[PDB]
Each structure stands twice: as C-alpha cells, then as structure tokens.
Design a binder for this molecule. Structure first.
Ligand SMILES: CC(C)(Sc1ccncc1-c1ccc(C#N)c2ccccc12)C(=O)O
Length: 472
C-alpha cells in the first residue's frame, strides 16, 4: 500500500527534487577521496644525495658522482663511493636520503616517507588497502542500517568521513596512514550505499532511470572536481584537510532531511512516519489528500547469465580501478587529465548508448568492453613521441569503460526471471567491489618488464567482453 500512499502524498514535485540536489552534492566530494591517490602520492624524479653537489660545472659534477641509468636518466638508486674523476663496478645504495624534484608538487607522501627504490611495493599497496576498506565497509553497513534507520547512518557516516579525513592528514608514520584511510574508505562506502537507497526509496514510477542516472552524473562531475581542486592546493597535508572539511558542513545540514517513510512502517514507528509524511506534504504543496492519513491506513499498510554479469562487473572494476589511479604512466599533464575523463564520459556514454542500443541489447554490452580494452591494448605499440595520439587513446578507453557501467546497470540486470532488479544489481556490486582490491596489485609487476601490466590490463576486458557473445 506504500505506492498508493506515495501517490497520495506526492511524486516528482518540489521535495523529491530538493532531496536529490541535497544528496547528489556529497557524491562529488566522495569521488574526490577515492581518486585523490593520484596527486597525493605522486612520484617525482629522485636522485641520490651527494656530498659534492647539494652543498656539504654542475653538469660535470652530476655526471661524475651518479652512474648513468638505463632510461636516459641519471641513476635513481645508486651513487659512486668516491668521485670517479677518471670520467672526463663499485656502487653503494643511497644512505643519506634522496633528493627529489620540486617543480610541480611540493610534498607528496613519497617525499615525506621515502617510498622509492627498495621500498617501492608499499605504494601500490596503500591503494589496495583503501579498496579493501571500501569492500569491508560496503558489507558491514548493510546489516547496520536495517536496524538503525536509513537517515541516521548517513548522518553519522558524514561525521566519520570528516573526522577520519581530518586525522589522517596529521600522522607521522606510514602504518597509521594506512589505517585511517581504511576507516575513511569504509565510511565512504556506507555513505554511497545509503545515499542510493534513500534516493530510490522516496521515489516511484519515475525512479529507475533518472535517479540512477543522477548518481553516475555525480561521479563524472566529481572527477572534474578532483582535477580542479588538485590544481589549486599542491601539498598533501593541506589537500586532505581541504577535501575532508566539507563533509562536516554536510553533516550539520543533514539533520533536516526526512527519513525513509517505508522503513518506518515495517518497524512500528507509525507516529513518526505520519509526521514525516505530513511534513513532506507541506513542502510538496499537495496538502489536499494528506487529510486522509489517520493512522489506520498506515496500520493496514504495515545461471549462465548470472556468471556473465559476474565476469563483466569484475572486468570493469579490475580495469577501471587499476588504470585510473596511475595516470602518470598514461601520458603527461596530470591536472589536465582527471578532468577530461568526465567531460569525455558524459557525451561518450550518451552517444554510444543511443546509437548502439538500437542494434540490440547484447550488442551494446559487447561493444562497451571490447572497444575500450582494444583501445588500451593498442597503446603499447605507439612510440613515445606521438603524445596526442596515446593520450587520446587512453582518454577514450577510460571514458568508454565508465560508460560500460551504465550500459550494464539499467540496460542489463533484466537477464533473469525478471521479478525485481535489486536482487541482482546488489549481487553484481559485490563482485565489482571485490574485483578492485585485486586491482593495483597488478601494477606491482612493473619488474620483469613494464609492458606486461598494460598488456594484462587490456587483455582482461577484451576476453571478458568477447565471452558475453557466448550467452546461449
Ligand atoms: C565499486 C563501484 C563499482 S566504483 C566506485 C567506488 C567508490 N567510489 C567511486 C566509484 C566510481 C568511480 C567512477 C565512476 C564512473 N564513471 C563510477 C560510476 C558509477 C559508480 C561508481 C563509480 C561502485 O561504486 O559501484
């Protein structure tokens, strides 16, 4: 009887739009704390400290103390025991600290904790830890909102994000920074899950397409917001503070939004449900049918396809979260990137969807994975002087991968006995989230050659997409 009550109280109107505007804005900043691990842990050019240079012909002094490296650069991990003045065999690891290049970034976490050379694996692990935190927090919060409400959990998760972010920028050692970020990730996952549930709960009929389109648009704009904010603040201790502070301001205003009116009924909190419904009616201005509500009415109210979807979600999560966090290897000008991604994404997603869906439902699913995977794979062959071509290929690949989610979210999930889609989208989301903690771990394989990470990162989407043609 809840849909009839919602029709009696509203639908579309004013409040159902103010709630969307008030809830979408936190998603922009939520995106900022997931892709922030691209301007915070940025690796500049690091050389070895020398007693000759850098105080107790600059070019000759640099050439005599540091042996030449393989990639046409001074060596980043070794120095000469004694100035080899024979240069008009014996090398010792750096023992006086590195010297970094401060020309685009002032202080990253790499600069402050020397995560270079031998201690290199720790950098692709500080991201897998965050994704494991998101995975854990997206599973714990599921069993903590059906008993504590759907609005209180969001309000407290805002405060948790704010406090954990404001603390994580003031730690003196790596292990604690790898734990407070875990807490931030769990709280962010809770925020996203509850925002989606609240967005759908209050809306009917015109709820499926538009509201879930709004969330994807929010993420796409959050990417541009991340780029713009990173363009301004250059340090890393003043970036986490500036990104985590707005969540406290969101927490204060989050005390006025009404709670879900469908959860209040199944628990017996009829009186407050009535208060919430009448309050919503006044904002919606449809204060004509609300006189009907007199407690009693609310008292009466109170396999192959599945595996294919599993693999598609896993491939999307794997490739996207392994590629979007290393944009220093897809080209240059990191600030210009991370902003063209969303601007490409929205036109690309809309235009690709509109044209391809007319071919068929399976064709759109197939062409949204093979195309970006092949675009990424065809990036190795390009020589390292056509910067525009490789940058365009990478941007197109990421934009198409972003569109794959939408093309597999509301267009897909029908490939089942077709009762309701929240018993399948939620199952796919656990695979998508569990396919990202196995993400940046592939980037640990930069040794044994450097082409292999990109090769795997392009092959996996291609095989996953080509397996979708085997539906029967
Ligand atoms: C776990 C995923 C699949 S990814 C995600 C997790 C945490 N924070 C942000 C995103 C995210 C990033 C870029 C997107 C794009 N384009 C996007 C689109 C839809 C949903 C999430 C994202 C989810 O959240 O379902």
């Amino acid at each position: 009887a809840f849909p009839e009550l919602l029709d009696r109280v509203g639908g579309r109107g004013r409040f159902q739009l103010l709630q969307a505007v008030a809830l979408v804005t936190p998603i922009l900043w939520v995106t900022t704390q997931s892709m922030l691990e691209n301007f915070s842990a940025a690796v500049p050019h690091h050389r070895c400290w020398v007693p000759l240079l850098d105080n107790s012909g600059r070019d000759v002094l640099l050439a005599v103390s540091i042996p030449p490296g393989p990639d046409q650069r001074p060596h980043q991990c070794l120095r000469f025991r004694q100035p080899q003045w024979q240069l008009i065999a014996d090398t010792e690891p750096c023992e006086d600290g590195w010297v970094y290049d401060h020309s685009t970034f002032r202080s990253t976490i790499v600069t402050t904790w020397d995560l270079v050379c031998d201690s290199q694996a720790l950098r692709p692990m500080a991201q897998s830890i965050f994704l494991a935190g998101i995975l854990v927090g997206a599973a714990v919060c599921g069993h903590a909102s059906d008993r504590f409400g759907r609005r209180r959990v969001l309000t407290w998760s805002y405060l948790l994000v704010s406090v954990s972010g404001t603390i994580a920028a003031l730690m003196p050692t790596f292990p604690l920074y790898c734990l407070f970020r875990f807490l931030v990730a769990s709280a962010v996952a809770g925020v996203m899950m509850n925002t989606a549930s609240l967005l759908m709960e209050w809306t009917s009929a015109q709820a499926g397409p538009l509201m879930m389109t709004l969330n994807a648009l929010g993420f796409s704009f959050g990417q541009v917001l991340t780029g713009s904010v990173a363009y301004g603040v250059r340090s890393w201790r003043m970036l986490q503070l500036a990104v985590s502070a707005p969540f406290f301001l969101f927490f204060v205003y989050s005390w006025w939004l009404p709670e879900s009116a469908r959860w209040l009924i199944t628990v017996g909190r009829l009186d407050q449900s009535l208060r919430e419904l009448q309050r919503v009616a006044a904002v919606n201005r449809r204060k004509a049918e609300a006189d009907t509500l007199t407690v009693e009415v609310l008292r009466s109210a109170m396999r192959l396809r599945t595996f294919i979807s599993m693999l598609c979600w896993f491939a999307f999560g794997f490739t996207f979260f392994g590629l979007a966090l290393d944009l220093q290897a897809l080209g240059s000008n990191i600030f210009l990137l991370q902003a063209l991604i969303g601007i490409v994404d929205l036109p690309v997603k809309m235009g690709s969807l509109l044209l391809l869906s007319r071919l068929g439902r399976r064709l759109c699913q197939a062409s949204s994975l093979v195309l970006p995977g092949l675009c990424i794979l065809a990036n190795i062959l390009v020589p390292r002087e056509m910067g525009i071509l490789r940058s365009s290929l990478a941007v197109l690949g990421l934009g198409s991968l972003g569109a794959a989610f939408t093309c597999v979210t509301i267009f897909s999930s029908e490939l089942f006995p077709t009762v309701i889609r929240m018993t399948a989208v939620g199952l796919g989301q656990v695979a998508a989230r569990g396919g990202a903690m196995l993400g940046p771990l592939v980037r640990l394989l930069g040794v044994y050659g450097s082409w292999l990470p990109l090769l795997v990162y392009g092959v996996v989407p291609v095989l996953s997409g080509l397996a979708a043609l085997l539906l029967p």
